[PDB]
């Protein structure tokens, strides 16, 4: 029962299953 992805901050999933729509890299999340 993992939530707010421990890699980004715009999803509630896990790294392997993570894809943050912020930039063209991996986790360009501006808040974190």
The residues of the shown chain that bind Zn ion, judged by CB under 5 A, are 5, 7-8, 11, 18
Q: How far is the CB of 30 from Zn ion (least distance, A)?
A: 14
Q: Using CB atoms within 10 Å of the CB of residue 8, give its burial: 0 to 12 exposed, 13 to 18 middle, 19+ buried.
A: buried
- Measured from the CB atom, is 11 or 30 closer to Zn ion? 11
Residue 3 has which token pair?
A: 């939530």
Least distance in angstroms from the C-beta of 18 to Zn ion: 3
Q: C-beta of 13: minimal distance to Zn ion in Å? A: 6
């Amino acid at each position: 029962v993992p939530g707010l992805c421990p890699r980004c901050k715009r999803g509630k999933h896990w790294a392997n299953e993570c894809k943050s729509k912020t930039d063209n890299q991996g986790n360009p999340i501006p808040p974190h």
